[PDB]
Design a protein around this ligand. Structure first.
Ligand SMILES: Nc1nc2c(ncn2[C@@H]2O[C@H](COP(=O)(O)OP(=O)(O)OP(=O)(O)O)[C@@H](O)[C@H]2O)c(=O)[nH]1
Ligand SMILES: [Mg+2]
Lengths: 111, 85, 74, 77, 111, 852
RNA sequence: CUCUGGUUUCUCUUCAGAUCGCAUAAAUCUUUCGCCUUUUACUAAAGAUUUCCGUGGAGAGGAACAACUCUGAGUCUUAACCCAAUUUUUUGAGGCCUUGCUUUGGCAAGGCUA
């Protein structure tokens, strides 16, 4: 067996890549549930930055801490689904539309 | 099957040596050579009793935990069932 | 396997050797092989009469070795 | 390697009794037990076929010329 | 349903390389010494602000150090001053520098 | 017994049966540097012996570091004993009493306590960091404590997954670590019989995270199992150390063939390990199944779906199996302890080996006198009752059997520090569960209930109505000195008794803690460092006493000395107006204090050898060399008392009549000190004259001792006095870049960088420096925060140095809340510590004279 | 050599204090604040409850194709060629006589042999 192959350094780097890049399997999340800059403002502020951005960093951290501290575990629901109930009703039907078309539809309906 | 020894394992067993001694103990282990492991083992010389009205037991010796080398083993029969312990 | 007997401890020591046939000799261990064949130097036959006779350096085949006993401290 | 052999090696450092093919009975501390049943022992009491006893500091008996060994009951568990 | 996934190591390496720009390339949490949620919890509970950290309202009603009346204990004629005991020291060792450490969180030591 | 215990490979009955046979008992202490793998190694041994307890996949189970503070902080805080039955590579089981010790440098008292009752030391060395501060200190301590030592190089997977070094350079790194260890051992030990080398079996290679542990013997045994014809012992003898393999001849040589063949170690041990790790980590989905098939390792589909790290741990566990190399190491190279008993009694027991009890104990048989020795005190989770943990050197402890407990101050003449007690229950302490037993024979470790009351730190437990010539084992000698000092008071004065109980309990729990009450009614605690004192305060405030406690700001304890001979020879007389003493004071020579402290000289010596040393080494006249009386506050103190009294002026018999009283006065004076009531260091007090009264009721007792102290004080004050500051030795492990930042932070605090070097084989640097203890407060957090956590430091007490200023200067003016410049730090430190102690405002060189 | 267990998807019922969620909203009440001039709207910390945006587990029902890889189980259990002078399927330890002991039978010692 050869000592090292084409994809050995890559695996070794993945061993220390940050989450989720250290995994090789798992579940699927929501685009809302995936924040991209949370790790950006969790870090120290870059040196030589203006006071307004510094305070932005500080307040972002403040609200992150507040959410983390006030978190409480969810409660035991019974798993009732609003849109499943609507579909079960007879006043609604399903179709596949372009998102922009649905957006114009919703704008008109709201008006 | 290989079972012919493994069947009698844990049982009380009457083993006959090449000099003609009788070793009775709990058969707990064996091997390729038939080296045997005998727990709570006693040795008899004069007889194997079948209810000898005079007495059943003469020259009995308590040995205890015995390892017998297979070289010197001749044969084995079932003497009694396994003690539960 | 093809193991050595663990006898380095007994090398160049005076020993008492019990052999088959009720035979007994005494001498200094000079070497051995995996069969437990021995080289014994300054060997002496301990005749059943009680008399002892010097036979010099000898080979004892491990086959016929019953028991050995050190006459020294190892 | 045999199951009984492993149990023998387990008795190294314990007081054991050994009978030879010639019926001499050696009791003392088992120092070393080899795979082939070669046995190094110390501070022995030997009981010959005539009944007489003797005392030896150091012995080594060839495996082939052993009839059997008695080990402690400390091992049975 | 698009609920679970299991990728292969070359895929994972390529995705990591592409995402590189969004990741800080940190292989340890030594960076966040006194800058993680636990240190922030301690600072909040003690109503102190890490220089770069957030700043909350006092969890308890702060002890005014103009309130204690100069006992034998807190006499200032006995105190040898070498370096001003900064807030970082009190967060680092909450039980050696604080009186009344309540709802304080111990912080992971070096890794 | 019959208590409930977790499922185990072995059986408690067999454990008890082994306990009787002292030739199969191995008392070992696991020690090393911080975070070097000791706790995870113990965890993995526990997993091997307890198939039910299992380490979590992404979280590491410890099974030591049980305390809440330990779990939260991540650093072990207390030593933990574990008694197990581990098999040998040959298949023979032994009983292992393994005391896992903390790695942090502040908690070295736990390590010393474990050493006192251990017979062997296993030193864990990280494969990437190498030899560090605590490793050096612990090697020194173990060789000085006369223990056999073996080494385990842990975290060898860092060389493959972090530095990704080539096999040959990884081998070079390991060889360099071994050479460093051997150098240190030779430096600290005269005897060369203790040479560490894997060929001999004194060194093992381990990776505790991925469950790997082996010696040359064990990895040759694996080859023997795969191919049956090898003698793994000879194979192991040939593997390591510049022995190249010739495959054409199938023979090994000291000469390299082809000029490109790697050593047999690299060819056979290292390279396949590299291959296994690389294949698991990089090609898990392409050829890993084939490689495991080649290795004979078959793993279930549920298993092979794991992430990389759990998969690595599982595969390596399956390949290697048990930690038999460790057992081989310890069984071969650590006494029985039937063999190791005699050095233990020679070193520890105060009555000496030659004593009849010395022989009775060096025999180490269960059927003899009882001579238990308790070094640790473990508190029940409720924190109410303590249990004494100690070793049984002779006899047998029986539950319910009355015993006699002797404290550290007991002597065969002063028979009042003893007390009869009754032992309730006995335990065989596994880390997270205690086996209750009925008895414990000699040569084992035991937890004893009901004997905690008459002891504080260390005790010896004997039997009443016997052993009338029984003496106490020497109290623990600690690797360092507790210097940092804090003051403690309750918030509500109504709850003082609770705080007092807490103080007593923490004093019992922490071996090196010193709690005392000053003259001003201030309760003071002495500790080694800030983390140490933080843990102490947490335990006091939460575990033992449940009240609110205020803590004063940290401060260090200073010492007092002189820099030149007394201006005039001072004197005093007894309240009786007889018994006149006359003394002088001078400074000692360089290094003499170090000799006395390190026991290079002992007063117990015969005056012949004592004068021989004094005359040959430090250029003294034998007249003075044979005129020594005392060695400072203790038998080993840094101040000397000579009596220059010529025979023509004082009757030597009369002087010897009050020798003991004058010695007591001298020792008390040195212990207290006039400047600030703190130890006096590095001073030679010379009795120039002693007029001794005639009658014993006119001399001795309450006449000479006060006069002796007053003369000592006057002579010291006449000699130019100075304060001495404790100094900490700091070692920082930083990146190649942050060295300048370390320089800056240290320079901000009166620091002085002694050295800065690279760590061979690693991209990091070690910066060694000296800091003042009083400025050291907050230094480590300053460094870590300023450098963004990339630099880490550990500090330890090194030596005493003179504070820059002149203390007894009344010209200077001090403001209450300003950091003073250097030229009067002495005056500030003296006045403020005087205030703390509650003494007068200032001390005058005439205060203790008889004239004013 | 054979028998279970499949996968995807739709819906219903019920438990979940597990980072049920590697993210994060709103409302009400209480206490303590900003104040305060009344309602909305609020200010900022704590405690409690609720609703919404989302889950996992188990059971039930439906409908689409794969049906022995895997999980196990029923099955743990082998033959072509060559071999034994320390531990059993080749082992030359073979005999006799005398003496002593023993109620005899029987046991111990020496010698003779080829
Ligand atoms: N890479 C690698 N890391 C390890 C290995 N073993 C332990 N560690 C890590 O080293 C760190 C030190 O943890 P422990 O070994 O449990 O701590 P310790 O050895 O008891 O040292 P103390 O905390 O001072 O008692 C842990 O966070 C582990 O994750 C190893 O074999 N390889
Ligand atoms: Mg630890």
């Amino acid at each position: 067996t050869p000592l090292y192959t084409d994809n050995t350094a890559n695996g070794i780097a993945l061993l220390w890549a940050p989450r989720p890049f250290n995994l090789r399997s798992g579940r699927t999340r929501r685009a809302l549930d995936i924040p991209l800059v949370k790790n950006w403002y969790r870090e120290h502020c870059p040196a030589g930055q203006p006071v307004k951005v510094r305070v932005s960093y500080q307040k972002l951290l403040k609200y992150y801490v507040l959410n983390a501290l006030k978190h409480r575990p969810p409660k035991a629901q019974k798993k009732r689904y609003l849109f499943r109930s609507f579909k079960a009703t007879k006043f609604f039907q399903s179709t596949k539309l372009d998102w922009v078309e649905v957006g114009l539809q919703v704008c008109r309906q709201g008006y | 099957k290989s079972s012919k020894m493994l069947q009698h394992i844990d049982y009380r067993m009457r083993c006959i040596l090449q000099d003609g001694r009788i070793f009775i103990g709990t058969f707990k282990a064996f091997d390729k050579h038939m080296n045997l492991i005998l727990c709570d083992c006693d040795e008899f010389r004069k007889i194997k009793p079948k209810n000898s009205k005079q007495a059943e037991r003469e020259e009995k010796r308590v040995l205890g935990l015995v390892l017998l080398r297979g070289e010197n083993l001749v044969s084995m029969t079932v003497e009694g069932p396994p003690p539960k312990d | 396997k093809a193991h050595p007997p663990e006898l380095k401890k007994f090398m160049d020591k005076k020993l008492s050797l019990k052999l088959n046939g009720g035979r007994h000799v005494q001498g200094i261990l000079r070497g051995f092989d995996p069969f437990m064949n021995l080289v014994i130097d300054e060997c002496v036959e301990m005749a059943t009469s009680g008399q002892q006779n010097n036979i010099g350096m000898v080979v004892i085949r491990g086959n016929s070795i019953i028991m050995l006993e050190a006459l020294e401290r190892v | 390697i045999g199951v009984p052999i492993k149990v023998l090696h387990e008795a190294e450092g314990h007081i054991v009794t050994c009978e030879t093919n010639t019926g001499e009975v050696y009791r003392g501390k088992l120092i070393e037990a080899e795979d082939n049943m070669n046995c190094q022992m110390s501070n022995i009491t030997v009981t010959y076929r005539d009944g007489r006893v003797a005392q030896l500091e150091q012995v080594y008996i060839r495996g082939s010329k052993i009839r059997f060994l008695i080990l402690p009951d400390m091992l049975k568990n | 349903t698009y609920q679970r996934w299991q990728f292969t190591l070359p895929m994972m390496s390529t995705l990591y390389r592409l995402a590189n720009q969004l990741l800080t390339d940190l292989v340890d949490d030594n960076y966040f010494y006194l800058f993680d949620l636990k240190a922030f919890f301690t600072s909040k509970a003690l109503n102190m602000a890490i220089p770069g950290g957030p700043k909350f309202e006092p969890l308890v009603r702060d002890i005014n150090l103009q309130d204690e009346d100069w006992n034998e204990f807190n006499d200032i004629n006995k105190i040898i001053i070498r370096q001003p005991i900064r807030t970082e020291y009190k967060i680092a060792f909450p039980y050696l520098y604080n009186n009344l450490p309540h709802h304080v969180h111990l912080t992971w030591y070096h890794t | 017994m019959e208590q409930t215990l977790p499922v185990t490979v072995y059986e408690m009955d067999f454990l008890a049966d082994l306990m009787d046979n002292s030739e199969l008992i191995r008392n070992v202490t696991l020690c090393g540097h911080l975070h070097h793998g000791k706790t995870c190694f113990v965890d993995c041994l526990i997993e091997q012996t307890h198939p039910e307890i299992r380490k979590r996949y992404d979280q590491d189970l410890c099974y030591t570091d049980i305390l809440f503070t330990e779990q939260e902080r991540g650093v072990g805080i207390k030593s933990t004993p574990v008694t197990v039955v581990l098999p040998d590579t040959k298949g023979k089981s032994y009983l292992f009493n393994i005391m896992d010790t903390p790695g942090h440098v502040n908690f070295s008292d736990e390590v010393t306590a474990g050493l006192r009752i251990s017979d062997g030391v296993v030193l864990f060395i990280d494969a990437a960091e190498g030899v560090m501060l605590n490793t050096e200190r612990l090697i020194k301590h173990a060789v000085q404590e006369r223990l056999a030592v073996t080494v385990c190089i842990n975290k060898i997977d860092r060389l493959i997954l972090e530095l990704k070094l080539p096999p040959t350079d990884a081998y070079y790194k390991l060889r360099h670590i071994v050479d460093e260890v051997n150098g240190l051992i030779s430096m600290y030990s005269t005897d060369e019989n203790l040479i560490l080398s894997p060929l001999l079996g004194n060194v093992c290679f381990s990776s505790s995270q991925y469950s790997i542990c082996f010696t040359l013997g064990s990895f040759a045994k694996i080859y023997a199992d795969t191919f049956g014809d090898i003698n793994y012992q000879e194979f192991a003898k040939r593997l390591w150390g510049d022995i190249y393999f010739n495959p054409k001849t199938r023979k090994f040589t000291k000469k390299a063939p082809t000029s490109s063949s790697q050593r047999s170690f690299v060819e056979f041990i290292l390279e396949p390990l590299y291959k296994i790790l690389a294949q698991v980590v990089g090609d898990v989905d392409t050829s890993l199944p084939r490689t495991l098939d080649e290795l004979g390792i078959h793993l279930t589909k549920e298993e092979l779906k794991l992430n990389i790290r759990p998969l690595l741990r599982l595969v390596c566990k399956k390949f290697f199996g048990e930690f038999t190399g460790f057992v081989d190491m310890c069984v071969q190279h650590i006494p029985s302890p039937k063999v190791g008993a005699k050095p233990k009694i020679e070193h520890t027991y105060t009555g000496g080996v030659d004593s009849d009890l010395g022989e009775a104990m060096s025999d180490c048989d269960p059927d003899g006198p009882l001579m238990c020795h308790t070094t640790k005190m473990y508190s029940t989770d409720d924190g109410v009752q303590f249990h004494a943990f100690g070793r049984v050197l002779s006899g047998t402890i029986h539950a319910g059997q009355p015993v006699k407990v002797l404290g550290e101050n007991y002597t065969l003449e002063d028979e009042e520090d003893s007390q009869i007690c009754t032992v309730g229950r006995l335990w065989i302490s596994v880390a997270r569960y205690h086996i209750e037993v009925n008895r414990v024979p000699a040569g084992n470790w035991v937890l004893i209930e009901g004997v905690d009351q008459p002891i504080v730190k260390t005790a010896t437990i004997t039997e009443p109505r016997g052993n009338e010539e029984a003496q106490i084992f020497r109290p623990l000698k600690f690797n360092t000195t507790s210097v940092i000092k804090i003051a403690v008071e309750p918030v509500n004065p109504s709850e003082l008794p609770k705080m007092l109980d807490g103080l007593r309990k923490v004093n019992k729990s922490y071996p090196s803690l010193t709690t005392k009450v000053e003259e001003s009614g201030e309760h003071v605690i002495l500790g080694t460092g800030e983390l140490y004192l933080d843990c102490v305060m947490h335990d006091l405030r939460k575990m033992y006493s449940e009240i609110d406690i205020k803590v004063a700001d940290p401060v260090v304890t200073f010492c007092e000395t002189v820099v030149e001979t007394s201006s005039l020879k001072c004197f005093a007389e007894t309240p009786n107006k007889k018994n006149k003493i006359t003394m002088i004071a001078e400074p000692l020579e360089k290094g003499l204090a170090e000799d006395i402290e390190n026991e290079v000289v002992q007063i117990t010596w015969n005056r012949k050898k004592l004068g021989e040393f004094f005359q040959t080494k430090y250029d003294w006249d034998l007249l003075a060399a044979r005129s020594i009386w005392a060695f400072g506050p203790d038998a080993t103190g840094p101040n000397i008392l000579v009596d220059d009294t010529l025979p023509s002026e004082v009757d030597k018999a009369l002087l010897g009549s009050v020798k003991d009283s004058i010695v007591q006065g001298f020792q008390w004076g040195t212990r207290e000190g006039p400047l600030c009531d703190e130890l006096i260091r590095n001073v030679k007090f010379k009795i120039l004259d002693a007029v001794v009264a005639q009658e014993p009721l006119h001399r001795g007792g309450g006449q000479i001792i006060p006069t002796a102290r007053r003369v000592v004080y006057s002579a010291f004050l006449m000699a130019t006095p100075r304060l001495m500051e404790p100094y900490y030795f700091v070692e920082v492990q930083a990146p190649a870049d942050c060295v300048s930042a370390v320089y800056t932070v240290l320079a901000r605090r009166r620091g002085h960088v002694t050295q800065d070097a690279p760590i061979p084989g690693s991209p990091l640097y070690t910066i060694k420096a000296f800091i003042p203890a009083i400025d050291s407060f907050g230094f480590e957090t300053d460094l870590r925060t300023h450098t963004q956590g990339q630099a880490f430091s550990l500090s330890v007490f090194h030596h005493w140095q003179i504070v820059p200023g002149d203390p007894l200067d009344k010209s200077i003016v001090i403001r209450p809340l300003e950091p003073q410049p250097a030229p009067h730090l002495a005056r500030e430190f003296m006045i403020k510590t005087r205030r703390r102690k509650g003494l007068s405002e200032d001390v005058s060189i005439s205060k203790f004279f008889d004239d004013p």
